Amino acid sequence: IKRIGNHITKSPEDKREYRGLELANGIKVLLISDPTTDKSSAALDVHIGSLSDPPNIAGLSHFLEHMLFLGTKKYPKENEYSQFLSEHAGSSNAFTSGEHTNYYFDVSHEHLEGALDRFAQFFLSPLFDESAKDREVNAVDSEHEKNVMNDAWRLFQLEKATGNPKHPFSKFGTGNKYTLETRPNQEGIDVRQELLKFHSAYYSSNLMAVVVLGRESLDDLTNLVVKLFSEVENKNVPLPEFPEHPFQEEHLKQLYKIVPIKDIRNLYVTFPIPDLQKYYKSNPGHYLGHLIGHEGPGSLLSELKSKGWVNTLVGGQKEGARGFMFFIINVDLTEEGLLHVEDIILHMFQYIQKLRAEGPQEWVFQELKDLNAVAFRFKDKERPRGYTSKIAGILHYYPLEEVLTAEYLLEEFRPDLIEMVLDKLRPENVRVAIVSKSFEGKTDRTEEWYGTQYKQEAIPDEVIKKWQNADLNGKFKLPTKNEFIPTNFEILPLEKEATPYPALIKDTAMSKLWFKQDDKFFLPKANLNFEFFSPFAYVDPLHSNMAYLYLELLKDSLNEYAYAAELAGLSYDLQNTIYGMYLSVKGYNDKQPILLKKIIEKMATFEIDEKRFEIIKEAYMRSLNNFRAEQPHQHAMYYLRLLMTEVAWTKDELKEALDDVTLPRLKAFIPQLLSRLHIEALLHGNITKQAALGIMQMVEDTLIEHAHTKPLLPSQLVRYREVQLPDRGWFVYQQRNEVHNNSGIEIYYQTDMQSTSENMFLELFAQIISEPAFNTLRTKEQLGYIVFSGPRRANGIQGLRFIIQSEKPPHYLESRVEAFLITMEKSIEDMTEEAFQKHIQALAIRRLDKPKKLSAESAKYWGEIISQQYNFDRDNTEVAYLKTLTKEDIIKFYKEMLAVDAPRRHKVSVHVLAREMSQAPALPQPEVIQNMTEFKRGLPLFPLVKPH
Amino acid sequence: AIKRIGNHITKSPEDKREYRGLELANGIKVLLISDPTTDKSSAALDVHIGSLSDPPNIAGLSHFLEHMLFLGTKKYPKENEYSQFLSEHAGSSNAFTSGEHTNYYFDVSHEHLEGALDRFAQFFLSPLFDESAKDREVNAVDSEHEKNVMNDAWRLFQLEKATGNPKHPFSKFGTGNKYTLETRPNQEGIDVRQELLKFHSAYYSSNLMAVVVLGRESLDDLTNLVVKLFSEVENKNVPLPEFPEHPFQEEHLKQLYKIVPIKDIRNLYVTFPIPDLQKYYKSNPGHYLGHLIGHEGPGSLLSELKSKGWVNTLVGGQKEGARGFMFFIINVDLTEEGLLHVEDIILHMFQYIQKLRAEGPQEWVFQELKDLNAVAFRFKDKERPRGYTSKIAGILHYYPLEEVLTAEYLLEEFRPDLIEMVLDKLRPENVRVAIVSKSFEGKTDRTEEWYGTQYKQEAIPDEVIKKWQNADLNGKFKLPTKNEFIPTNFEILPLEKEATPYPALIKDTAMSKLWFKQDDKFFLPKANLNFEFFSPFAYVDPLHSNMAYLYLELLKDSLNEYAYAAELAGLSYDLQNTIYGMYLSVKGYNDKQPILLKKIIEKMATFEIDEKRFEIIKEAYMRSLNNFRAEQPHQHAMYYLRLLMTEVAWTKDELKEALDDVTLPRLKAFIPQLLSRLHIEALLHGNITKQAALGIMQMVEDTLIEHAHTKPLLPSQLVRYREVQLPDRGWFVYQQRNEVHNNSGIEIYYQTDMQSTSENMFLELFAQIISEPAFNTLRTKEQLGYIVFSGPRRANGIQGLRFIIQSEKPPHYLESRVEAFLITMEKSIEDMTEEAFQKHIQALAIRRLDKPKKLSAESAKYWGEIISQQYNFDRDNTEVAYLKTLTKEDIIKFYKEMLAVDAPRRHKVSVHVLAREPEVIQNMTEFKRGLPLFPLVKPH
Amino acid sequence: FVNQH
Amino acid sequence: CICSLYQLE
């Protein structure tokens, strides 16, 4: 009741009333009211990172958030928070950064109290026990154990490592069961007392901020949050910070050489800079990021493309902890790009000096500020979970008025700070890091935490005083005036024939359309998507392999053009699919024709630059064979899909048939793919119907004019089918993951086709076991960190599956899955009526749920139009059937389909095992699959779903 | 008249049938055939009596006598008694009439030698000529001439006989119509019977008989069986018919004729009259000219006539005539503009003749033709037991008793002077021309006497003549290159340790698959090889299927001119297509098939296209496609039903439009892409070894990689199409209306199941028990139609039962009466005794069990099974061993659930074809959308 | 390609 | 948010 805000800045598009305030204990509290919300939510953000761990025990903050979910004193039950949040269509999640820790959930329509009080008790008083600390370090072990081979983490921790080892930046965030449990009891240090001291010392102070997205009012719930978080008492803890940047000059001007596990090649150029979060109005780091990492005519990337060294580069500044900041230029390399690294970084300082001779620019600032203002003014709607965590995550830095207008509105252009940050980029401030797999036997030093190998080649002063000596220019230039900036912001009015669902308007043997004027959102922007078909796209590996090469070289030769469209707010995307290729252009309403047209005319009338083809061929050949270095459960989900379809070729087939694709072969292939084809598309958003027909008209007329496209026969508009397992079966086949020391498994129960009365059986049964599966297979039995069980839907045919990876041998896992099945049905027949209607209500709220963003319903319409079902109302009638279901019905679904004695039992299993590898029921004999194609030769195939 | 003169006769040692030639003192040539291994015995008698020696007033008298000599002998004067003895014991007699022969022949069931000979010898003792024979056989002559009305052969032959000297007996009529037999004699009061006995008594009995007996008795039983009952023949010493003059005596040489045919055909007929060369059978120059004219090789005559696009095919050579004279004919086909360049064509024929007049006779050609017909005589295959005897009795008149088997199949000496003589006979003073063409309407007044066709004299003017003789030069015509592949290695190879009775898989790779079988049962110097080339790109799009078609078509059109001379040596082949890939068959001797197959692979790897040739083949297949509007509606039903039941099927409508888009560069791109990457499969069968079999297949895949860089296929894309699955209750139907044929077909399919070993005999046995009664009731009693068929279907591993009926009815009426017929057999099952049952399974048993009769037959059965991926080599024996252990209730229990009307497993679907005047099925794709697909069969 | 985006 | 989470998302 200390501070109340009067009115804050909101976009005139929003409707959500806001209020900011501050409590007696100094918590910055933000209140959001919404009359038309449907899932309320809340979050909190304690400003304590993993950079405040004690030196003996490493990774307490992460172990603490990981242990806080389990157990309080006002709710001694182990799962009452998770169980109550999952009975009400909600989900809770949390994480720790290096500087702070976010806690956030969401909940159903009005159940704020019964879940907010559970989230509040979270911090008033937690109670731990032997059990939790005893079976949680196994989950933190799986956490580290999935990232010891994870290539996004080894460089992160190796940059954390080779710095100032007396500095708090050189700290470990995770803990690997050895420093957490085994080291402190190696020397008798207790852990529970350390956890209660950590929590009572750090977390309880002013530091944390809260936010709640309420339904009721902006005065009904302000008096709610003043009586519910008032207990946490300010201990006057100042924010931990440290003015000394971790890079001291002894370890500057140095060039490491790191050896990866998966085959990649990269060059990181690291500069240290002081803190510029205090300067959040001029934002000099975004200026130099806009001027360095910019594709287009005559810029840093396009020249490195032109010399054949570099595929892409990312500029901008990395932000680390508080009181210090970084600045990174990270590049990847071609085969002979790794020979000329000194010349690459020489060109980088060439472009820097070309930007230092001319310095600041007024019109670039005005352009960027106009772009952020227009991008703020039509800011789309937010999903209420994740949004409140974001605006609680930046609430520590900014005052109450501009909590929303953060990095969107800019007041002044001050060239002095541009010049300041542009002076700190000097080759006395460099730290080069090279990643290449060619250094296998050359590395002396190794990492202790993760076990990676690297070097010290400190750069002698030859090449430093070759870098800053004489830097005039290459063929660089500044970017030119933008023409994709939008000018039309007019909402077109609703016409006479206004429909709630997209209607078929054109139906010819060449194309079809699906059109709907936007009725809800009124944003001057629309999304257009297309799916071109060809029977030649997946005939054999060679023709399934040329498709990715052609499409990729199209994206290569057109990014140079269309980066200004992706920068102004018009994004396109063109990738291949199994049946044919695909296209999706979304964004502001004004410049779709220009962009789409240019995409088509670059698509049909397409030449090949030979060196570009020869680069992309190798960059894909090195992207097939490094599929073997990847997670076990992803290999399970890869193998299961290949076996359960009519035709598909492995990653071992396609990389053998890349020894044949050549330029003349590919060059006659493009007229073969675009010779006869068929188009299917939806148009969505704010467009009139005559302009919709004009869009498809220009599209198919350009393909007529340049490609001589003819329509396909309707008997070769076909899909693929799914293998039908025998009425009683136990299919399993094992493969061996080569580089991960874990095992993994996926088991598949296939029921039937897409019906309106049989999707709700499997959906409800996958909702009744969603929490107990997590609760008894990850928490209680501690089988690993990756546990998931839900509906899998391919080709219409629905099946319930289980993805799980662990240290244990996999048939042990499949047996204890069966134990979970038995315990589940025993818990189903015992459960009461009221909880059963609660589960039905949780599914009727989760599924009967309106999409907020316009792309969230265009991806709801398109995802079924590409499945040829065309059923737009399956969210209403299906859930109207869900309300009339009985308790015995689920047992009738269960007994003959999922049970062990069932007559109708379809089950196939994929075992991925490792490099060197409570009552269980009785399993029948398996039959092993030693060959996929001889397997798929003797089984029938399901029929396809008839359209609506 | 028992006179005997004979001795040992040289017969090629492959044959085991014992023979004997002799001659009886009343002038009767007698041959005796003894094969105690023949099923049906036969006999034949040839009279060398000239039709030329017939009364001028009454025509075709020996023809009317050989009709009248049938009925009535003195030992059995009853009417049908000869005919009844041949109606009981399956016999059939038939004689013809030529300028010098009438040739009776017949057969008998097993032993009825005594019987038929008692009804056959005493024709010479007592011919009867009664009321009823007369009055029925005169109608038999009138119906024989009436059926030879539309017979174009007799008509053109009579037109060749009659437009010479009208006094010469070459201009007589062979058959005789109703006007000369019973119209002029009865109005002149002359008795036909009195004339018949003159002809029969005076002429027949004298000499020149050619009796022969296909018997199975002994070397003596049949000897004193026929020599005893042929002594009533009494000599008269009738003079042999002969001519010292040619019937074309300069009135009609260098003359044209314009012939009007009923059927729309066009032909060109060049005739040279030539003297007798029957005595010169040692060299046979007339067949030597027929060999050198109709050769089709590098620089051949038809090669240039094709290269100019006027002439489809030709045939030429020596045509026998009467004893005195012979003819030398050339009969050529016509294109549209071939009818305009006739003299040019003929000028090129003379040019060729002149090239032979330049290089003279040839000797190595004579030695090569001598070895090829010597081998072709050595390894003959068989002979029908009826007709053979009438043939060798036809030439028994003209040849000594040692030459009746080595008839023309051996050549002693070389006679080049005769070849200069006949080259002097082939000149334009001598030519006689006739042209057949439909466009000759209203222009020919001079009508034929018997048939009534019309022609014109229209003498050739002299400028066309003089251009032929003095202007004679050579173009692109060269003597045929020697096709010598050294055919001397005819040895048989003995069976080795690999004594399997069924083909073993001697090679499997990811590239090919090779099965092997040396010949145990036949032991012939022959070999057969079959090859399938599987590839995905064949049936992907209507355009790819058309391109594969055109590829094999032009491959054959390219290779035919080279291949035909090797086919003349006894090595035949075929290139055909599959829905899956390409089909290659090579059958013939073992000595030189490797070089031929090698050159076939080298040929279709490196392949070229000619333009106008490609255009003619293109138009040709476009015509063959839009013809399908004009075919039989039962074929329409079989075409539509198969299209509905399989996975993918390109309709002829889609193929029609797609064919137009095909171009030459596009095909030239398609060929190496198809041949790029493929799989092989082969069945090697004959007198060969395993190591040489491996070496030939090695050769084959090595030539494929050497030419077009063949790579193996992936073992996930050797997929085979599946079959649509019926929803267990469905009776589906739709209709298709024919336009042209005013006939309504209907096909009623019933799906049982995949082929398990039980299901083959459930369906086969039930199919055969409904086979013969369907023949009894459907055509005869219900009078549904004329094209009515029933039975199994073996396709894509799925059994089926069908009823194809085309007639002119409403089709639903016909389905309803089919179901009434199904009820008739359903109740006719349960009233079946044990005897019908047992005769039915024994009928099926002997139907299934049978040894082969040629190496190609068993090889075709093994190949027909390897292409189906079953590999069950003894399914015959295993299925038969299962087959005798079935019951009546087993087929009751098979019948009801799958086939009945109240059936739980009834999978029924029909196709209605209408004439020019459940649920419906609008789109066959939307039909096939929701039906599942069957698994395939595990290969054994 | 700015690092933030 | 390379940040560890309580539950896989």
Side-chain angles (χ1 to χ4, degrees), chain A residues 92-95 143 153 385 778 785, chain D:
Chain A
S92 75
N93 199 348
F95 67 94
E143 173 73 25
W153 289 83
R385 186 256 192 185
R778 180 178 172 273
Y785 188 45
Chain D
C1 63
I2 19 82
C3 65
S4 302
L5 284 134
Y6 169 67
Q7 275 171 178
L8 178 72
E9 198 75 22

PDB file of all heavy atoms in Angstrom, chain A residues 92-95 143 153 385 778 785, chain D:
ATOM      1  N   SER A  92       1.905 -25.905 -14.648  1.00  0.00           N
ATOM      2  CA  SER A  92       2.864 -25.104 -13.912  1.00  0.00           C
ATOM      3  C   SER A  92       4.283 -25.450 -14.336  1.00  0.00           C
ATOM      4  O   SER A  92       4.570 -26.586 -14.713  1.00  0.00           O
ATOM      5  CB  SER A  92       2.694 -25.315 -12.416  1.00  0.00           C
ATOM      6  OG  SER A  92       3.209 -26.570 -12.011  1.00  0.00           O
ATOM      7  N   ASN A  93       5.165 -24.458 -14.316  1.00  0.00           N
ATOM      8  CA  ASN A  93       6.527 -24.712 -14.762  1.00  0.00           C
ATOM      9  C   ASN A  93       7.406 -23.597 -14.219  1.00  0.00           C
ATOM     10  O   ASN A  93       6.910 -22.564 -13.771  1.00  0.00           O
ATOM     11  CB  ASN A  93       6.623 -24.822 -16.279  1.00  0.00           C
ATOM     12  CG  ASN A  93       7.872 -25.524 -16.715  1.00  0.00           C
ATOM     13  OD1 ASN A  93       8.775 -25.746 -15.915  1.00  0.00           O
ATOM     14  ND2 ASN A  93       7.934 -25.901 -17.985  1.00  0.00           N
ATOM     15  N   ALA A  94       8.716 -23.825 -14.234  1.00  0.00           N
ATOM     16  CA  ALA A  94       9.621 -22.893 -13.578  1.00  0.00           C
ATOM     17  C   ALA A  94      11.031 -23.123 -14.088  1.00  0.00           C
ATOM     18  O   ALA A  94      11.350 -24.198 -14.594  1.00  0.00           O
ATOM     19  CB  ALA A  94       9.567 -23.062 -12.065  1.00  0.00           C
ATOM     20  N   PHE A  95      11.878 -22.103 -13.944  1.00  0.00           N
ATOM     21  CA  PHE A  95      13.279 -22.276 -14.320  1.00  0.00           C
ATOM     22  C   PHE A  95      14.159 -21.279 -13.584  1.00  0.00           C
ATOM     23  O   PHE A  95      13.684 -20.300 -13.005  1.00  0.00           O
ATOM     24  CB  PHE A  95      13.486 -22.131 -15.825  1.00  0.00           C
ATOM     25  CG  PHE A  95      13.233 -20.754 -16.344  1.00  0.00           C
ATOM     26  CD1 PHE A  95      14.269 -19.855 -16.491  1.00  0.00           C
ATOM     27  CD2 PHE A  95      11.957 -20.349 -16.665  1.00  0.00           C
ATOM     28  CE1 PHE A  95      14.039 -18.587 -16.959  1.00  0.00           C
ATOM     29  CE2 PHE A  95      11.725 -19.085 -17.142  1.00  0.00           C
ATOM     30  CZ  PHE A  95      12.765 -18.203 -17.283  1.00  0.00           C
ATOM     31  N   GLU A 143      19.233 -34.453 -15.666  1.00  0.00           N
ATOM     32  CA  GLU A 143      19.348 -33.131 -16.272  1.00  0.00           C
ATOM     33  C   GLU A 143      20.735 -32.882 -16.821  1.00  0.00           C
ATOM     34  O   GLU A 143      20.890 -32.532 -17.993  1.00  0.00           O
ATOM     35  CB  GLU A 143      19.006 -32.048 -15.265  1.00  0.00           C
ATOM     36  CG  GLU A 143      19.270 -30.666 -15.808  1.00  0.00           C
ATOM     37  CD  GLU A 143      18.268 -30.242 -16.829  1.00  0.00           C
ATOM     38  OE1 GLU A 143      17.149 -30.771 -16.792  1.00  0.00           O
ATOM     39  OE2 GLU A 143      18.598 -29.374 -17.663  1.00  0.00           O
ATOM     40  N   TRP A 153      25.294 -26.673 -24.970  1.00  0.00           N
ATOM     41  CA  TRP A 153      25.829 -26.502 -23.625  1.00  0.00           C
ATOM     42  C   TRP A 153      27.343 -26.573 -23.460  1.00  0.00           C
ATOM     43  O   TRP A 153      27.878 -25.903 -22.573  1.00  0.00           O
ATOM     44  CB  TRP A 153      25.201 -27.549 -22.721  1.00  0.00           C
ATOM     45  CG  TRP A 153      23.790 -27.286 -22.448  1.00  0.00           C
ATOM     46  CD1 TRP A 153      22.719 -27.613 -23.224  1.00  0.00           C
ATOM     47  CD2 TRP A 153      23.279 -26.559 -21.339  1.00  0.00           C
ATOM     48  NE1 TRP A 153      21.562 -27.172 -22.631  1.00  0.00           N
ATOM     49  CE2 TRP A 153      21.883 -26.515 -21.475  1.00  0.00           C
ATOM     50  CE3 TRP A 153      23.869 -25.955 -20.226  1.00  0.00           C
ATOM     51  CZ2 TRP A 153      21.074 -25.895 -20.545  1.00  0.00           C
ATOM     52  CZ3 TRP A 153      23.066 -25.339 -19.312  1.00  0.00           C
ATOM     53  CH2 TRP A 153      21.683 -25.313 -19.466  1.00  0.00           C
ATOM     54  N   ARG A 385      -0.237 -17.329 -20.315  1.00  0.00           N
ATOM     55  CA  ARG A 385       0.860 -18.000 -19.637  1.00  0.00           C
ATOM     56  C   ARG A 385       2.128 -17.778 -20.446  1.00  0.00           C
ATOM     57  O   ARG A 385       2.179 -18.100 -21.636  1.00  0.00           O
ATOM     58  CB  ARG A 385       0.487 -19.470 -19.451  1.00  0.00           C
ATOM     59  CG  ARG A 385       1.378 -20.383 -18.645  1.00  0.00           C
ATOM     60  CD  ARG A 385       2.180 -21.300 -19.511  1.00  0.00           C
ATOM     61  NE  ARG A 385       2.810 -22.343 -18.715  1.00  0.00           N
ATOM     62  CZ  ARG A 385       3.649 -23.245 -19.209  1.00  0.00           C
ATOM     63  NH1 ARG A 385       3.941 -23.241 -20.502  1.00  0.00           N
ATOM     64  NH2 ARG A 385       4.187 -24.161 -18.419  1.00  0.00           N
ATOM     65  N   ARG A 778       8.181 -40.486 -13.092  1.00  0.00           N
ATOM     66  CA  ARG A 778       9.307 -39.577 -12.933  1.00  0.00           C
ATOM     67  C   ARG A 778       9.566 -39.181 -11.493  1.00  0.00           C
ATOM     68  O   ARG A 778      10.719 -39.149 -11.074  1.00  0.00           O
ATOM     69  CB  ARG A 778       9.099 -38.295 -13.739  1.00  0.00           C
ATOM     70  CG  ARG A 778      10.268 -37.325 -13.603  1.00  0.00           C
ATOM     71  CD  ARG A 778      10.080 -36.080 -14.442  1.00  0.00           C
ATOM     72  NE  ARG A 778      11.102 -35.072 -14.171  1.00  0.00           N
ATOM     73  CZ  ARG A 778      11.005 -34.166 -13.205  1.00  0.00           C
ATOM     74  NH1 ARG A 778       9.942 -34.154 -12.420  1.00  0.00           N
ATOM     75  NH2 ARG A 778      11.973 -33.284 -13.011  1.00  0.00           N
ATOM     76  N   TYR A 785      14.344 -38.069 -16.802  1.00  0.00           N
ATOM     77  CA  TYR A 785      13.840 -36.715 -16.936  1.00  0.00           C
ATOM     78  C   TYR A 785      12.875 -36.532 -18.096  1.00  0.00           C
ATOM     79  O   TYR A 785      12.132 -35.546 -18.110  1.00  0.00           O
ATOM     80  CB  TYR A 785      15.023 -35.762 -17.126  1.00  0.00           C
ATOM     81  CG  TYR A 785      14.685 -34.301 -17.088  1.00  0.00           C
ATOM     82  CD1 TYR A 785      13.844 -33.789 -16.125  1.00  0.00           C
ATOM     83  CD2 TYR A 785      15.200 -33.435 -18.033  1.00  0.00           C
ATOM     84  CE1 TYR A 785      13.534 -32.457 -16.097  1.00  0.00           C
ATOM     85  CE2 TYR A 785      14.892 -32.103 -18.014  1.00  0.00           C
ATOM     86  CZ  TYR A 785      14.060 -31.615 -17.043  1.00  0.00           C
ATOM     87  OH  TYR A 785      13.740 -30.279 -17.014  1.00  0.00           O
TER      88      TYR A 785
ATOM     89  N   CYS D   1      12.808 -19.348 -21.789  1.00  0.00           N
ATOM     90  CA  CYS D   1      13.897 -18.335 -21.820  1.00  0.00           C
ATOM     91  C   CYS D   1      14.415 -18.186 -23.256  1.00  0.00           C
ATOM     92  O   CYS D   1      13.951 -18.966 -24.113  1.00  0.00           O
ATOM     93  CB  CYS D   1      15.041 -18.736 -20.898  1.00  0.00           C
ATOM     94  SG  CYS D   1      15.866 -20.275 -21.383  1.00  0.00           S
ATOM     95  N   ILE D   2      19.483 -21.457 -23.107  1.00  0.00           N
ATOM     96  CA  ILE D   2      20.239 -22.511 -22.364  1.00  0.00           C
ATOM     97  C   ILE D   2      19.874 -22.430 -20.877  1.00  0.00           C
ATOM     98  O   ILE D   2      20.790 -22.243 -20.053  1.00  0.00           O
ATOM     99  CB  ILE D   2      21.759 -22.375 -22.597  1.00  0.00           C
ATOM    100  CG1 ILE D   2      22.145 -20.983 -23.105  1.00  0.00           C
ATOM    101  CG2 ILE D   2      22.258 -23.464 -23.533  1.00  0.00           C
ATOM    102  CD1 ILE D   2      22.284 -19.937 -22.021  1.00  0.00           C
ATOM    103  N   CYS D   3      18.583 -22.566 -20.553  1.00  0.00           N
ATOM    104  CA  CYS D   3      18.135 -22.534 -19.133  1.00  0.00           C
ATOM    105  C   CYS D   3      17.463 -23.864 -18.767  1.00  0.00           C
ATOM    106  O   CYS D   3      16.604 -24.326 -19.545  1.00  0.00           O
ATOM    107  CB  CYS D   3      17.186 -21.369 -18.878  1.00  0.00           C
ATOM    108  SG  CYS D   3      15.615 -21.488 -19.774  1.00  0.00           S
ATOM    109  N   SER D   4      17.859 -24.469 -17.644  1.00  0.00           N
ATOM    110  CA  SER D   4      17.223 -25.729 -17.177  1.00  0.00           C
ATOM    111  C   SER D   4      15.812 -25.435 -16.657  1.00  0.00           C
ATOM    112  O   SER D   4      15.629 -24.357 -16.070  1.00  0.00           O
ATOM    113  CB  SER D   4      18.071 -26.392 -16.127  1.00  0.00           C
ATOM    114  OG  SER D   4      19.369 -26.675 -16.631  1.00  0.00           O
ATOM    115  N   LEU D   5      14.860 -26.350 -16.875  1.00  0.00           N
ATOM    116  CA  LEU D   5      13.451 -26.130 -16.447  1.00  0.00           C
ATOM    117  C   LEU D   5      13.032 -27.246 -15.485  1.00  0.00           C
ATOM    118  O   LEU D   5      13.713 -28.283 -15.469  1.00  0.00           O
ATOM    119  CB  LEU D   5      12.553 -26.123 -17.688  1.00  0.00           C
ATOM    120  CG  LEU D   5      12.595 -24.853 -18.536  1.00  0.00           C
ATOM    121  CD1 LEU D   5      12.727 -25.195 -20.011  1.00  0.00           C
ATOM    122  CD2 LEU D   5      11.357 -24.003 -18.296  1.00  0.00           C
ATOM    123  N   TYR D   6      11.997 -27.018 -14.672  1.00  0.00           N
ATOM    124  CA  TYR D   6      11.476 -28.097 -13.789  1.00  0.00           C
ATOM    125  C   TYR D   6      10.874 -29.221 -14.640  1.00  0.00           C
ATOM    126  O   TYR D   6      11.132 -30.403 -14.339  1.00  0.00           O
ATOM    127  CB  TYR D   6      10.437 -27.536 -12.814  1.00  0.00           C
ATOM    128  CG  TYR D   6       9.661 -28.580 -12.052  1.00  0.00           C
ATOM    129  CD1 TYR D   6      10.281 -29.394 -11.120  1.00  0.00           C
ATOM    130  CD2 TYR D   6       8.300 -28.748 -12.254  1.00  0.00           C
ATOM    131  CE1 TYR D   6       9.577 -30.355 -10.416  1.00  0.00           C
ATOM    132  CE2 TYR D   6       7.580 -29.702 -11.558  1.00  0.00           C
ATOM    133  CZ  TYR D   6       8.220 -30.510 -10.635  1.00  0.00           C
ATOM    134  OH  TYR D   6       7.515 -31.454  -9.943  1.00  0.00           O
ATOM    135  N   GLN D   7      10.115 -28.863 -15.680  1.00  0.00           N
ATOM    136  CA  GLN D   7       9.433 -29.880 -16.525  1.00  0.00           C
ATOM    137  C   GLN D   7       9.777 -29.635 -17.994  1.00  0.00           C
ATOM    138  O   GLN D   7       9.858 -28.455 -18.388  1.00  0.00           O
ATOM    139  CB  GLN D   7       7.916 -29.786 -16.361  1.00  0.00           C
ATOM    140  CG  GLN D   7       7.370 -30.570 -15.179  1.00  0.00           C
ATOM    141  CD  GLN D   7       5.910 -30.274 -14.942  1.00  0.00           C
ATOM    142  OE1 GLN D   7       5.274 -30.843 -14.058  1.00  0.00           O
ATOM    143  NE2 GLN D   7       5.363 -29.368 -15.739  1.00  0.00           N
ATOM    144  N   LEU D   8       9.957 -30.707 -18.772  1.00  0.00           N
ATOM    145  CA  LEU D   8      10.211 -30.549 -20.229  1.00  0.00           C
ATOM    146  C   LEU D   8       8.966 -29.918 -20.860  1.00  0.00           C
ATOM    147  O   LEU D   8       7.848 -30.338 -20.506  1.00  0.00           O
ATOM    148  CB  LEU D   8      10.491 -31.930 -20.830  1.00  0.00           C
ATOM    149  CG  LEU D   8      10.735 -31.952 -22.338  1.00  0.00           C
ATOM    150  CD1 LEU D   8      12.089 -31.348 -22.676  1.00  0.00           C
ATOM    151  CD2 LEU D   8      10.633 -33.367 -22.884  1.00  0.00           C
ATOM    152  N   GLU D   9       9.155 -28.956 -21.768  1.00  0.00           N
ATOM    153  CA  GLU D   9       7.999 -28.249 -22.379  1.00  0.00           C
ATOM    154  C   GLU D   9       8.053 -28.415 -23.902  1.00  0.00           C
ATOM    155  O   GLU D   9       8.225 -29.567 -24.342  1.00  0.00           O
ATOM    156  CB  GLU D   9       8.007 -26.773 -21.976  1.00  0.00           C
ATOM    157  CG  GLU D   9       6.675 -26.077 -22.189  1.00  0.00           C
ATOM    158  CD  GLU D   9       5.595 -26.425 -21.178  1.00  0.00           C
ATOM    159  OE1 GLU D   9       5.946 -26.865 -20.066  1.00  0.00           O
ATOM    160  OE2 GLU D   9       4.404 -26.255 -21.508  1.00  0.00           O
TER     161      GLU D   9
END
